[PDB]
Amino acid sequence: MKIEEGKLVIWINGDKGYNGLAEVGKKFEKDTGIKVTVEHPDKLEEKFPQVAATGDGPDIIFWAHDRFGGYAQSGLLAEITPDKAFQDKLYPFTWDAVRYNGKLIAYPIAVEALSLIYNKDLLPNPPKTWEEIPALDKELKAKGKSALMFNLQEPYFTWPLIAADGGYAFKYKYDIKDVGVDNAGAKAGLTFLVDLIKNKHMNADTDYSIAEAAFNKGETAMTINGPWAWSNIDTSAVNYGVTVLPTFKGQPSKPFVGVLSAGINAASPNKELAKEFLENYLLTDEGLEAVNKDKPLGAVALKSYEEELAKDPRIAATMENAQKGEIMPNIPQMSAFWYAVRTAVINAASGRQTVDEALKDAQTGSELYRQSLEIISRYLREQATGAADTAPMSGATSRKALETLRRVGDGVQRNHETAFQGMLRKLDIKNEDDVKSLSRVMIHVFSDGVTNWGRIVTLISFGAFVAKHLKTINQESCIEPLAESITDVLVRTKRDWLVKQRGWDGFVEFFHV
Ligand SMILES: CCc1sc2ncnc(O[C@H](Cc3ccccc3)C(=O)O)c2c1-c1ccc(OCCN2CCN(C)CC2)c(Cl)c1C
Numbered sequence: 269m270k271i272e273e274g275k276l277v278i279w280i281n282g283d284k285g286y287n288g289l290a291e292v293g294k295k296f297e298k299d300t301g302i303k304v305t306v307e308h309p310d311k312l313e314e315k316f317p318q319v320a321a322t323g324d325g326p327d328i329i330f331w332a333h334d335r336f337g338g339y340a341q342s343g344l345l346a347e348i349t350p351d352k353a354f355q356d357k358l359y360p361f362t363w364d365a366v367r368y369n370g371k372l373i374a375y376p377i378a379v380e381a382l383s384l385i386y387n388k389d390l391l392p393n394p395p396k397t398w399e400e401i402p403a404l405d406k407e408l409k410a411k412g413k414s415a416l417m418f419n420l421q422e423p424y425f426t427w428p429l430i431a432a433d434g435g436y437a438f439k440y441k442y443d444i445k446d447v448g449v450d451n452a453g454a455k456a457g458l459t460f461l462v463d464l465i466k467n468k469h470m471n472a473d474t475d476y477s478i479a480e481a482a483f484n485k486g487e488t489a490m491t492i493n494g495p496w497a498w499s500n501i502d503t504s505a506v507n508y509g510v511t512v513l514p515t516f517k518g519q520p521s522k523p524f525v526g527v528l529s530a531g532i533n534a535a536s537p538n539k540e541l542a543k544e545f546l547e548n549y550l551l552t553d554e555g556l557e558a559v560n561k562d563k564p565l566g567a568v569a570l571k572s573y574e575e576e577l578a579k580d581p582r583i584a585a586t587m588e589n590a591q592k593g594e595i596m597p598n599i600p601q602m603s604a605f606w607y608a609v610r611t612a613v614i615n616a617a618s619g620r621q622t623v624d625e626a627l628k629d630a631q632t633g634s635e636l637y638r639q640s641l642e643i644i645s646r647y648l649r650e651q652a653t654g655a656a657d658t659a660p661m662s663g664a665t666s667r668k669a670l671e672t673l674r675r676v677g678d679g680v681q682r683n684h685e686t687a688f689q690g691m692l693r694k695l696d697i698k699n700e701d702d703v704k705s706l707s708r709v710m711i712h713v714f715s716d717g718v719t720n721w722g723r724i725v726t727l728i729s730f731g732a733f734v735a736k737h738l739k740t741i742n743q744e745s746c747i748e749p750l751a752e753s754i755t756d757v758l759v760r761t762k763r764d765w766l767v768k769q770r771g772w773d774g775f776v777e778f779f780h781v
């Protein structure tokens with residue numbers, strides 16, 4: 269087993285107070301003898317699922333809660349079971365953020381939302397609207413300054429504007445069928461952003477470091493950032509305020525709210541130690557103070573300490589932005605959603621694609637898993653049972669993709685029956701455990717090779733062949749898991765290619781009669 273027993277390794281992002289966290293570790297080590305190592309790897313949110321899948325990684329991972337449902341769905345996190353008395357020390361809505369499929373999958377630490385950060389010496393009155401920023405920038409450029417710089421590389425920072433006039437990720441329970449990435453609100457916000465770039469009020473290449481340095485040196489009047497940033501601003505002696513984000517088309521900017529949370533690796537042989545550290549050392553007044561003093565956490569989950577911090581006007585502004593925003597969903601398709609929108613924003617800002625092209629692709633990318641599952645699940649089930657699903661189907665594409673797959677998929681099963689049968693007789697499929705062991709095979713087979721529509725039809729057509737078998741041996745319950753497996757394999761390893769082909773519209777086009 270890869271993770272070492274008798275110590276704690278912790279991963280946390282490099283913008284958080286990891287020196288403070290290490291101080292809490294020192295205190296844990298003092299009491300118990302157990303060494304605590306804090307690390308801050310680049311791209312840790314993409315690295316964790318890769319390493320944890322193989323049984324490796326940190327004992328504890330810290331991230332906003334949006335990534336944790338994906339982790340939990342993949343079996344990477346231990347269920348946490350604090351008692352009533354500990355649960356009652358934290359705000360109920362923070363626990364809701366870390367609930368997935370009825371189980372608690374992490375400990376909530378703190379509530380974070382973006383705010384408008386402004387230099388009070390340059391801009392005694394910050395703008396109320398995004399619409400007035402171009403004029404303010406022109407005024408400021410005549411004095412050697414700029415109005416606003418913020419990270420354009422990460423969609424978390426552009427999202428408040430995109431969402432203002434109507435963009436949304438997943439509607440309201442969260443409806444995974446209803447995605448608002450390329451609606452009219454979304455387009456208007458992204459367009460306003462690209463116009464700021466086109467008119468030289470911002471630069472498409474601005475990232476976290478460039479924006480932070482410009483603000484902290486007094487060269488730009490505003491930035492958009494989170495509570496973590498306030499420490500470095502204090503160091504710089506900029507006279508800053510923290511306030512409400514500007515409105516767009518009369519409506520508030522809607523930041524996605526995150527709950528910084530701590531999850532325990534399912535492979536860790538140190539779960540009792542991790543729970544003891546998190547509950548009795550970190551999530552205490554002193555523990556959170558030590559972290560907070562290094563980089564501010566925002567509104568902490570711990571009611572006792574939150575009451576002390578609540579008086580701070582920067583925190584009050586954070587909560588006001590948070591109330592106008594929306595708690596991020598934690599569903600497993602969040603990762604895909606962020607990856608598509610990141611790409612959309614970068615390509616739109618750079619002029620690689622137009623706003624319409626960019627957000628079209630993002631909408632495709634964000635809907636891809638669900639749309640694929642629907643198609644694949646329907647085809648496997650109808651093949652296995654001999655009757656189609658009567659529920660309505662998005663709808664036109666799905667219906668036509670299913671019609672196409674019925675032609676080409678039946679061809680493949682028919683002409684390749686003997687290899688199919690042979691490969692299904694080799695494997696001793698008879699229950700959910702074997703199907704479990706199929707993705708593995710499919711992952712090494714499907715990936716290793718060319719990516720084209722024929723190889724995709726092959727995977728799905730073999731899927732159907734298996735489903736038929738499953739039905740005859742009264743293992744019908746295993747079909748939907750089979751469809752989820754095939755779908756995951758397809759959309760994880762071929763996402764970029766699929767988005768390039770216009771998704772399933774492409775599939776319909778390619779095999780068109
Ligand atoms: C779960 C297995 C999967 S998943 C999957 N995904 C994409 N493509 C696949 O196959 C195509 C090539 C191919 C086209 C047409 C029919 C078979 C395969 C490819 O990899 O490009 C597969 C196979 C696969 C891979 C190999 C096979 O056959 C392997 C060779 N023989 C060995 C002897 N035995 C009797 C039959 C299988 C068989 Cl029977 C399947 C379903």
Ligand SMILES: OC[C@H]1O[C@H](O[C@H]2[C@H](O)[C@@H](O)[C@@H](O)O[C@@H]2CO)[C@H](O)[C@@H](O)[C@@H]1O
Pocket residue numbers: 281283313332333334335380422423424425494526606
């Ligand atoms: O930009 C997409 C990104 O947004 C959020 O990440 C935030 C994070 O929540 C904050 O703690 C801070 O570190 O900045 C990050 C943005 O760079 C999501 O939590 C994340 O999953 C998503 O990829």
